[PDB]
């Protein structure tokens, strides 16, 4: 329950991410692709690699779907709480949230089984990597995989002002708080809850933003040291594993950041609507 993030990107929808599994699955995807791009004759294996990863993802999602009944119960409680007795309504929110997390933990073994399959497949591909001479293995796999799978994400990140998104959220949180205090009720207890929700979401966004910024710089510097050059086989495998670690850590926070950003602004509409209702209707 410490490494589980909850997202609500759109009204009436809820999902969850077990953070170490996302990172784990993502890591072995980079490792697999690096293993097939090292030789030009194994490029065509990408169809099989894509198809295996797709099967793993569907298998993982099918395990997630087992908690759909508990999940939709929580969703309908959130709708009641966000669309205006509050202690009873909030107590039912915490208990339903607790059932969701217990449902997720009761399927850890199913989740781990699918994760171990991805690891084994990626490692089997990794183990077949060969060189013309082990004293100077090529790094074409590292270069190609970066150019075709990673570079677009680094540029998409660099094209954003993630720090400004945080200041925009902090200002929204501060101004909405100062609004509550200079007010004058079921509408008040509701606004305090969504504000508390948006505040936790914001701290999660801030957590991932810091990661993205660190990893953005780390990746861009490390990739320069690992391409258009050769390495002894032991060193090549080490750098591939290191790149795949950086990539997966970057991709997890980037992924979660976007989903959390959407959740924050999905909640803000409720906040704004309940404020406009407390003023113009009442």
């Amino acid at each position, epitope marked *: 329950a410490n490494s589980i993030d909850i997202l609500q990107e759109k009204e009436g929808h809820l999902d969850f991410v077990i953070i170490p599994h996302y990172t784990f699955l993502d890591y072995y995807k980079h490792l697999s692709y690096n293993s097939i791009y090292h030789k030009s004759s194994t490029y065509g294996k990408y169809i099989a690699v894509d198809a295996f990863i797709k099967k793993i993802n569907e298998a993982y999602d099918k395990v997630k779907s087992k908690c759909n009944d508990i999940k939709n119960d929580l969703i309908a409680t959130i709708k009641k709480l966000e669309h205006p007795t509050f202690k009873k309504m909030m107590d039912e929110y915490n208990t339903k949230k607790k059932k969701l997390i217990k449902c997720i933990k009761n399927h850890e073994n199913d989740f781990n089984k*699918i994760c171990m*399959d991805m690891k*084994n497949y990626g490692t089997n591909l990794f183990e077949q990597l060969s060189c013309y001479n082990n004293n100077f293995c090529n790094t074409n796999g590292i270069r190609y995989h970066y150019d075709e799978y990673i570079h677009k994400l680094i540029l998409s990140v660099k094209s954003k002002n993630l720090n400004k998104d945080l200041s925009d959220m902090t200002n929204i949180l501060q101004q909405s708080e100062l609004l509550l205090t200079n007010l004058n009720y079921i509408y008040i207890d509701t606004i305090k809850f969504i504000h508390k929700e948006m505040k936790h979401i914001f701290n999660r966004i801030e957590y991932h933003t810091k990661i993205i910024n660190d990893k953005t710089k780390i990746i861009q510097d490390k990739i320069k040291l690992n391409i258009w050059r050769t390495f002894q086989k032991d060193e090549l495998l080490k750098r591939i594993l290191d790149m795949s670690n950086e990539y997966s850590l970057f991709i997890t926070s980037d992924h979660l950041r976007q989903m959390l950003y959407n959740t924050f602004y999905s909640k803000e509409k409720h906040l704004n609507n309940i404020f406009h209702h407390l003023i113009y209707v009442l």
Partner: antibody
Amino acid sequence: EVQLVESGGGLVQPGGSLRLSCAASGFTFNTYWMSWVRQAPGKGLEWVANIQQDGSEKDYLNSVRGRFTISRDNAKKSLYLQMNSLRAEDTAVYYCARDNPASAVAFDVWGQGAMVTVSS
Amino acid sequence: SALTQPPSVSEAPRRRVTIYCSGSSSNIGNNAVSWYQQLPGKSPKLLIYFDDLVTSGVSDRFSGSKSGTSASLAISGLQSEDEADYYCAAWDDRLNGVVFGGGTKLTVLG
């Protein structure tokens, strides 16, 4: 390269006990689910048992529950099938197999097979 | 057996062969289908898994498919070397075990 070698087959009396062993090599045995599959002479394949990497989950064919125990020892890279209360219908070649992907329940590596005969 | 396969199928070389695996919603309908080739006197080997993935090293003439409660294995550009017994398997939720098909013997003509 990847290899699975069975041992411990033979003739057993009905109601008797027999233990099969499987020596694995050429792969990280500790990271995979492992299995047993049997084939009666001239007949089809029939799954017997699966076991998780650390042994915490074990699955069995309905007709062998309570009588058979699948076990492993990752340090020795060995798979086991303790067969108790043997019946004539248990007579078959028993294959040690690797279950990969385990989410797919796929027997991707097979041994040479160990003959087990339950007769009076 | 919970999965129904033709006892035998046959086709001339250079052509395409299909082998069906008929099951139910507790097995094929909800689980991944595997396919195996067993040559005479040999141990079985995996051909297809996750319904339609081809195991590494297996020829691309072997393909898999599944829809509803029925799965199928296709062999194209047939060779007499393909003469063997073919099995389908999948997990069954009601039995909590693997159900195997009864097998299909492949006869290459001519």
